[model samples]
Target chain A: MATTTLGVKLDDPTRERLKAAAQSIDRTPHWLIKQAIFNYLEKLE
Target chain B: MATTTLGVKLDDPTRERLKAAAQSIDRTPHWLIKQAIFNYLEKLE
Candidate 1:
């Protein structure tokens, strides 16, 4: 199925942290960010 | 430095599609959503 997309910018520090986290976990930064959103939203509702 | 987080909810269908799309690309649904948000916000501004 077709899907939509979103985009946002992060400060250099935050982006670097994300990259570090992803590397530490053996996952891509892209994967970590998506999972982070899901988990955060899940916690809220 | 510290980082902020965002929370969002998704309908079942949307979530499922995200999962499918992620799988197709060998990534997690979480990654797809984050990338989508990033791309969308970037294009908007």
Candidate 2:
């Protein structure tokens, strides 16, 4: 399947926080961010 | 400024549903999806 990309620019603090969150869960930051996007959209729609 | 890109692949049905959801809320699907990701990750950490 073809894929879509979400590009974001964030301040240093926000980026670091997500990085920390991902590590705390033993997941990559990209994985954590993508899962959150999918889960929330699924809930709303 | 540098940026990060998150990529995802979804089935047609899911994509359509998200499009519908975004329209109903008067938002672009991309914006809606990114907001969800940011909100969720922020809440957790």
Candidate 3:
């Protein structure tokens, strides 16, 4: 498997929120950041 | 203007290295990380 690829620094509250979001999406926190950023950018069009 | 939309957590040693790299490239650390990752991914061919 490909090593999980991501890095991020978030405040404590935001980090907690990301954890919750990850649980909802069934992905690790790292993957959640990638998905969130890419998806948010996609919606900007 | 867009918010500076980048964040990363690294230890003191890596951060010192990153600072040196940033000085060489004439960009902030955040921009440097974005550039590095995007370039790495683009070269996967």
Candidate 4:
């Protein structure tokens, strides 16, 4: 399978959350979004 | 601000992990990624 982006849209509120959360949380929003996906997937079991 | 997407790229292994995780986790991979973003953002608080 070809590599691709999993693009998800958030509402303005959560979108703002994503922006600010990226700040003190200390990662770019793009990095954190990708990180969160793996962090969660690995935790499911 | 303009509407946009949080696009996270998945290489083959991660792509399969996303699909595989979805199979057992019982959510669409798209939804799964979005939820992870929120869960992580909220949990950081």
Q: Write the per-residue lDDT of candidate 1 for residues A16-44, one digit (tens) a residue.
A: 65567668769877676665445433443
Candidate 1 overall lDDT versus native: 0.52
Docking class of 2: acceptable
- Candidate 2 chain A: minimum summed lDDT over ten consecutive residues — where? A1-10
Ranking by lDDT: 4, 2, 1, 3
The C-alpha RMSD of each candidate to the native structure, in angstroms, is 12.8, 4.3, 10.3, 4.3
Q: Provide the lDDT at B5 for model 1.
A: 41
What is candidate 2's CA lDDT for residue B4?
44
Instruction: Write candidate 1's Cα lDDT for B1-45 as tens digits.
Output: 122343333445557665676787688765666654443334433
Output per-candidate TM-scores for chain A, rounded to 2 decimals: 0.59, 0.55, 0.65, 0.53
The per-prediction tally of clashing pairs is 13, 0, 0, 0
Better lDDT candidate (2, 4) = 4
Quick one: best TM-score, which candidate?
Answer: 4
lDDT of 2 by residue, B1-45 (tens): 233453444445556666677788799976655454566565554
lDDT of 3 at B19: 55
Tens digits of per-residue lDDT, candidate 2, A1-45, equal: 333553444445656776787788798876765555466665554
Q: lDDT winner between 1 and 2, please give it.
A: 2
Per-residue accuracy of model 4 over B1-45 as CA lDDT, tens digit each: 333575556556866666676677689976655555566555556
Candidate 4 per-residue C-alpha lDDT over A1-45 given as tens digits, one digit per residue, 9 for 90 to 100 = 344675665556776666675676699976655665566656654
* Candidates ranked, most accurate by TM-score first: 4, 2, 3, 1
Alpha carbon deviation, residue A20, candidate 2 (Å): 1.8
Please list, in the order the candidates appear, how each scores on TM-score for chain B only. 0.55, 0.51, 0.47, 0.50
Specify the poorest-scoring 10-residue window by lDDT in model 4 chain A. Answer: A1-10
